[PDB]
Amino acid sequence: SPAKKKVIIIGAGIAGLKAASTLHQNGIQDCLVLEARDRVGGRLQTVTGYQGRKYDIGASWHHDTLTNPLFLEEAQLSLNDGRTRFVFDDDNFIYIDEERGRVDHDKELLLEIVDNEMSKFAELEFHQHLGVSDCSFFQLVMKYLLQRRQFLTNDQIRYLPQLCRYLELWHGLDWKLLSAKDTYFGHQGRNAFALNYDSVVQRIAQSFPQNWLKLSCEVKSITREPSKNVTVNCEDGTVYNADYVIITVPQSVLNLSVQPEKNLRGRIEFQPPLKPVIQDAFDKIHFGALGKVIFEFEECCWSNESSKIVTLANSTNEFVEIVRNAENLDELDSMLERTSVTCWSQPLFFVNLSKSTGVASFMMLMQAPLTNHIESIREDKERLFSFFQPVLNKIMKCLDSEDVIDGMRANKPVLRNIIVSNWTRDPYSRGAYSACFPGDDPVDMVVAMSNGQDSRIRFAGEHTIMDGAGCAYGAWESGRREATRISDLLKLE
Amino acid sequence: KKKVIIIGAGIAGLKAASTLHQNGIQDCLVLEARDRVGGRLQTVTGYQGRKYDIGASWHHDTLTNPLFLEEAQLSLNDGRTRFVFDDDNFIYIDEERGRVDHDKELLLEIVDNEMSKFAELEFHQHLGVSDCSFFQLVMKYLLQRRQFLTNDQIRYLPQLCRYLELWHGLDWKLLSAKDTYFGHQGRNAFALNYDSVVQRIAQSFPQNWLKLSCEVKSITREPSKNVTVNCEDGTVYNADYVIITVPQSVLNLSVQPEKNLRGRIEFQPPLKPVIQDAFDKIHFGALGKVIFEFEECCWSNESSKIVTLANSTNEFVEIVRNAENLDELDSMLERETSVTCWSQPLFFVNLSKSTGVASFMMLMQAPLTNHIESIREDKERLFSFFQPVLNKIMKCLDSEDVIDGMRPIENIANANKPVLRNIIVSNWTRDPYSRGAYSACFPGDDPVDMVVAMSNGQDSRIRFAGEHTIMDGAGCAYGAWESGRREATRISDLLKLEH
Numbered sequence A: 001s002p003a004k005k006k007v008i009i010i011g012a013g014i015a016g017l018k019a020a021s022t023l024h025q026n027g028i029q030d031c032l033v034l035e036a037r038d039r040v041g042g043r044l045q046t047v048t049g050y051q052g053r054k055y056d057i058g059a060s061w062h063h064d065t066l067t068n069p070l071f072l073e074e075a076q077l078s079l080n081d082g083r084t085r086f087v088f089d090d091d092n093f094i095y096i097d098e099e100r101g102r103v104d105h106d107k108e109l110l111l112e113i114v115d116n117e118m119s120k121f122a123e124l125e126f127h128q129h130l131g132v133s134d135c136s137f138f139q140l141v142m143k144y145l146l147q148r149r150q151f152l153t154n155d156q157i158r159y160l161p162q163l164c165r166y167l168e169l170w171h172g173l174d175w176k177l178l179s180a181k182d183t184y185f186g187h188q189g190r191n192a193f194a195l196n197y198d199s200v201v202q203r204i205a206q207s208f209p210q211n212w213l214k215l216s217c218e219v220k221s222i223t224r225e226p227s228k229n230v231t232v233n234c235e236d237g238t239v240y241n242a243d244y245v246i247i248t249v250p251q252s253v254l255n256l257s258v259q260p261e262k263n264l265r266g267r268i269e270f271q272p273p274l275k276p277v278i279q280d281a282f283d284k285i286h287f288g289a290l291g292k293v294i295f296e297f298e299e300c301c302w303s304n305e306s307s308k309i310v311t312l313a314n315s316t317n318e319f320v321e322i323v324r325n326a327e328n329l330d331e332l333d334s335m336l337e338r339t340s341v342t343c344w345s346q347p348l349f350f351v352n353l354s355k356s357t358g359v360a361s362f363m364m365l366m367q368a369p370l371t372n373h374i375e376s377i378r379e380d381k382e383r384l385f386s387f388f389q390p391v392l393n394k395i396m397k398c399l400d401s402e403d404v405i406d407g408m409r410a411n412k413p414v415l416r417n418i419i420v421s422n423w424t425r426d427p428y429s430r431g432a433y434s435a436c437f438p439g440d441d442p443v444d445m446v447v448a449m450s451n452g453q454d455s456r457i458r459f460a461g462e463h464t465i466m467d468g469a470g471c472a473y474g475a476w477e478s479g480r481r482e483a484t485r486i487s488d489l490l491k492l493e
Numbered sequence B: 001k002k003k004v005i006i007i008g009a010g011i012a013g014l015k016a017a018s019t020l021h022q023n024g025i026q027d028c029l030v031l032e033a034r035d036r037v038g039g040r041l042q043t044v045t046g047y048q049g050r051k052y053d054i055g056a057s058w059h060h061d062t063l064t065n066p067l068f069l070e071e072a073q074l075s076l077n078d079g080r081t082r083f084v085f086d087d088d089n090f091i092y093i094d095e096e097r098g099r100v101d102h103d104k105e106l107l108l109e110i111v112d113n114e115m116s117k118f119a120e121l122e123f124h125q126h127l128g129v130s131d132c133s134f135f136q137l138v139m140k141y142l143l144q145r146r147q148f149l150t151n152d153q154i155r156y157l158p159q160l161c162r163y164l165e166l167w168h169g170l171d172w173k174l175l176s177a178k179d180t181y182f183g184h185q186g187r188n189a190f191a192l193n194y195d196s197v198v199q200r201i202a203q204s205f206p207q208n209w210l211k212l213s214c215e216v217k218s219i220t221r222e223p224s225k226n227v228t229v230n231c232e233d234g235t236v237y238n239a240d241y242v243i244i245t246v247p248q249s250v251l252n253l254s255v256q257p258e259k260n261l262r263g264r265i266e267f268q269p270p271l272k273p274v275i276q277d278a279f280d281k282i283h284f285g286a287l288g289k290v291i292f293e294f295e296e297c298c299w300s301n302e303s304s305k306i307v308t309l310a311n312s313t314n315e316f317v318e319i320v321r322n323a324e325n326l327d328e329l330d331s332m333l334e335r336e337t338s339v340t341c342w343s344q345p346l347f348f349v350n351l352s353k354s355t356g357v358a359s360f361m362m363l364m365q366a367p368l369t370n371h372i373e374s375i376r377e378d379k380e381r382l383f384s385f386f387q388p389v390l391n392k393i394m395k396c397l398d399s400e401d402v403i404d405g406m407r408p409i410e411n412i413a414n415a416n417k418p419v420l421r422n423i424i425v426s427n428w429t430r431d432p433y434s435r436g437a438y439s440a441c442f443p444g445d446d447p448v449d450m451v452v453a454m455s456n457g458q459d460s461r462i463r464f465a466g467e468h469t470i471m472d473g474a475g476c477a478y479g480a481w482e483s484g485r486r487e488a489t490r491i492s493d494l495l496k497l498e499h
C-alpha cells in the first residue's frame, strides 16, 4: 500500500523547493514535496492589496548581495533578459523622535558616528575575549554608555540607545530579549529588494515535476524502519515509503516534536524520537517574531528623500541623569525603575516604497513582543489605524506633508488599506525565523540539524546552516546541500 | 658614563626617558638632532597667535588608545580641555557638480561601504595572494559590480573612496590595497595642543638628560658588554643600553652607503639581515599639511570635515561599461599633464566648527606633498594653486570667493568675504630628520617584518622604539609612545633586579 519514493521532502518553502529542484536536476525521480498550506513558498509569500498592489509579507530582501548565491543567480537572469527582478534600495536612514523630529545626519547629535563607535565597542568586547558572558543587547548598550559617558553629550546618551535599536528589526526581537553576542552581524554587501520574491518561488518550483507537489497535505509522523526505509503519514490518511526524507519545517514547528501531545497542527511524531543532541539544541536557540504592517495610501504626497525611515521610541532626560550619576552597571540597573504600550514604545522601521518602487505605500517592520500583539488584532483595521496614527503623522510631518486621513472605506495622505502579517498565529510558521536569546549557541542547532536524525532522515531550512542563517538564501543553500548528498548517495549502486 | 642612551626626542624617546626615570633609573641621556623636542609632533604659531599641529593632530582609536586615556584621566581630574572629538559627517565637493555627499540619488557612502566589504572579502583568508594597488582594487570592484552601480556611482565613487589616501599620505596607485583599510577603533579626538602632551612627558625626567642639536653619527656595539655612541660634534658617550628612536626613513639610511647623509647612523656591527630585509617590505608615506588662516569665519559651519574630489569623466564610465575583462580595463585606461588642486583629493578640516578658529587644516598626500612643501615660502604661488578649490568650498558653504589678504593692506568693503591672512605649510618630506610623515605600505609590503625586526632589537643592548616598531598604533602617536615604554621597561628591569 505505501507507495515507494526515492525522496520525500516535507515543506514547500524555499529550502524544500530548492531541494526538489536539485534532486530533479541530478536525475532523481519519484520524489514528493508535501506541503501543509494551500500554497508553496512558506515564509516567502506575496500578497495582494489596494488596487492589485503587491507586497512581500514574508521575506523582502536579498541580503549579502556580494556573496548571496541565490541573489547572484537571480542577477544573472536579469543580465540575460533585462528584466527587473529586484532593486537596490539601501538609502540614508531618516530617524525620527516624537518631539525632537528628524535626528539623522545631525551636525550636533552625530548619532550615526557614535553608533559606529558602539558597534566597534561590542566587537572589541566579544572578539578575542573568550569566556565573556552573554547578556542582552540592552545591557551591552548600557555598558557602552557607562564606559564612554565622559565622551558623549547628554543628547547623545539620550538618543543613541534608541537609534541603535533599529537592530531589533533585524532579529525580530526587543533589545532586552536579544543576545548581545548575536546582535551585530557582518552584512556582506548592499541589500536588494526583491520585486516579487514569489517570482523566485515560482521559478524554482517550476524547475521540477509538477505532480511532485502535494499541497494541503500535513505530515503528522515519520518513522525509521529497521529495514533501511522511511515511512511518512499525511493527516489525510495516506502513507508513504521513502529511502530519504528532508524535513524543512520551521525550527518552531519542529520543536513541537520534543513534547508530548501530538494533536498540534504541524507537529511531526518521530519514531524513534529525535536524538538527544537535537532535542537539547532547542534549549540553546530560539525564535524571533519579525512582523509586517502595510500602509496603502491613495497616492504619494510626501517627500521621497529616502526609502528608509526609522521612528525612535520615546527617551527621557531622566535617563541621561541616571547614566550621569550611576556608579556602575549594578547601580544603573537599580536606578532604572523610573505605563502602557504605544507606537512609541519601541522603534519601528518603515520602507517608503514610493521612492524605491513608485508605490504610494509604507512597508513597516515590527518586532517581538509588539508583533505578537499587533498580529493578534490584525483584523480590527480601525484599532490598527488608531495605534499607528501618531507615528504615521509624525512621519508625514518630517516628510513635509500633513496628517493621515482614514480612507479605508486633495493634498493630504489618504490611507486606503492596512495589511498585517500573521506568522505568529499560523501553526505552520509559529514566528518569523531563528534568533538568539542571551546565552544561546546557534551553532548547536546548525550542527545537530546538518548531521541529521540518521543517514536517512535529514533536515534543511534557514535554521540548519551557518552562512545565511535565518535568510532566504541560507534556507536555499541547505536545500541544495541535503539534496546533493542524497543525489550522490543514490548514484552509488 | 651613562646607563641608557636614548636617541631621538620624539614622543617615543620622551616616553622611554619618562619611564626610565619613573623606575628610579638615573644617569641617562636623550640625544636629539633638532633644536627642539617633539619630533613629528610640532605645534606652530600663526596669525593672531593661533596654534596648529603641523605634525600629528588626532588621538586615534580612542576606545583603546592608552595615551589618549591617560590624557582623558588628566582632564576628568582638572577639567582642562586637552582635546575635542571632531569626527563629523563628511562634505564631499566636486568641481563641476558641487556637493555629492548624503546624496539621495548618488548614495556614495553606501557603495563606498560595500566597496570596503568587497576589499575585506578579497583578502580575507587567502594569504597574501597577489597584493595590488588600492587603485587596482577599486577598478576590480567597479568591473565586478557595475551591473549594480549607476553611471554616476562608477564615476564619483572611486574619487570619494580616495579620502583613504589622506590616511596613509599616499596616492592610490602607490598604496598597497592589502593595507588600505584600517580598524578605526572608535572616534578620533583632535588634540588641542599635542605640544602639551610633549611638554608633559619632557618635564617628567631630569632636564639635564636632554641634549639638543646632537646628531648621532654612529653606534658601536663593543662585544665587551657595552655600547659606544658619539654625536657628530665629536663628543662620545658610553652606555650599556641604547634605545634608537630615529624614524624608519632615517634608519633606512644605515643600510645604504655614503654615511655622509644627514641624520644617518653608521652601525658597527652593521644591522643584521633581518633588520635590513625589513626595509624592503615596508616604506614611508608623505602626509603633508597646509594651514589656510582667515581673518574671521564667514562661511557655514555645517561640518568640520570637508573633502574636495579630484576631477572625473563620463569618459571613465564608458570604459568600465565596455571593458570585457580586467586586462582590457588596464589598456582602455592606460590609453585613456599639469598638476593642479583638482588633480587629487584634498582633505580640509574646518577648524571653525571644531575649535572656533577661522582656519582650514588641509591634508595632502604624495606625490603632491613634496611639490607643495617645496614651494612653502612662495605664498603667492601657494594661493594661486589652491585658490579654485578654496573658492569651490566657500561657494558650497554659502560664502564668496577668497580675497588674498596676506600682504598688509586694508579695505572696508570686504566683511562678507573670506580674507586669507596667512598660509602655513609643513616640511616633513624635506626635513632631513623625518624624511616623510610615517610608516606606510606600497603594494607587496608587509609591516609585521619591520615590527618584529625592530621589537627584537639588534641585540640585548641596541634596541628600537618609534611608530614603526610596534603593531598596535602603527604609525600613530600612541604607537610610538608605547614602543617607548616597552624598550624602557625591559631595560629598566634588567637593571633594577641587578643590585
Ligand SMILES: Cc1cc2nc3c(=O)[nH]c(=O)nc-3n(C[C@H](O)[C@H](O)[C@H](O)COP(=O)(O)OP(=O)(O)OC[C@H]3O[C@@H](n4cnc5c(N)ncnc54)[C@H](O)[C@@H]3O)c2cc1C
Pocket: A010, A011, A012, A013, A014, A015, A016, A034, A035, A036, A037, A040, A041, A042, A043, A044, A057, A058, A059, A060, A061, A062, A063, A217, A218, A219, A220, A248, A249, A250, A253, A265, A266, A267, A268, A290, A291, A292, A421, A423, A428, A429, A431, A432, A433, A460, A461, A462, A463, A470, A471, A472, A473, A475
Ligand atoms: C516577516 C519575515 C521577514 C523576513 N525577511 C527576510 C528578508 O528580507 N531576507 C531574507 O533572506 N530572509 C527573510 N526572512 C526569513 C526567510 O523568509 C526565511 O529564512 C525563509 O523563508 C525560510 O525558508 P524555509 O524553507 O527554511 O522555511 P519555510 O519557508 O517556513 O518552509 C517550510 C514549510 O514547511 C511547511 N510545513 C510546516 N509543517 C508542516 C507539516 N507538518 N507538514 C507539511 N508541511 C509543513 C510550512 O508550511 C512551510 O511551507 C524573513 C522572514 C519573515 C517571517
Ligand SMILES: Cc1cc2nc3c(=O)[nH]c(=O)nc-3n(C[C@H](O)[C@H](O)[C@H](O)COP(=O)(O)OP(=O)(O)OC[C@H]3O[C@@H](n4cnc5c(N)ncnc54)[C@H](O)[C@@H]3O)c2cc1C
Pocket: B007, B008, B009, B010, B011, B012, B013, B031, B032, B033, B034, B037, B038, B039, B040, B041, B054, B055, B056, B057, B058, B059, B060, B214, B215, B216, B217, B245, B246, B247, B250, B263, B264, B265, B287, B288, B289, B426, B428, B433, B434, B436, B437, B438, B465, B466, B467, B468, B475, B476, B477, B478, B480
Ligand atoms: C603630517 C603628519 C600628520 C600626522 N597625524 C597624526 C595623527 O593625527 N595622529 C597620530 O596618532 N599620529 C599622526 N602622525 C604620526 C605621528 O606624528 C608619529 O607616529 C609620531 O610623531 C612618531 O614619533 P616617534 O618618536 O616614533 O618619531 P619622531 O617624532 O620622528 O622622533 C624621532 C626623533 O629622532 C630625531 N633624530 C633623527 N635622527 C637623529 C640623529 N641622527 N641623532 C639624534 N636625533 C635624531 C628626530 O629629530 C626626531 O626628533 C602624523 C605624522 C605626520 C608627519
Ligand SMILES: CC(=O)N[C@@H](C)CCNCCCCN
Pocket: A061, A063, A169, A170, A171, A172, A365, A433, A434, A435, A469, A470, A471
Ligand atoms: C539572522 C537575522 O537576524 N535575520 C535574518 C534571518 C533576516 C533579516 N532580514 C529581514 C529584513 C529585516 C530588515 N533588517
Ligand SMILES: CC(=O)N[C@@H](C)CCNCCCCN
Pocket: B060, B166, B167, B168, B179, B285, B438, B439, B440, B441, B447, B468, B474, B475, B476
Ligand atoms: C605602518 C602603517 O601602516 N601605519 C601608517 C601607514 C598609518 C598611520 N596612520 C596615522 C595617520 C593619522 C592622520 N591622518
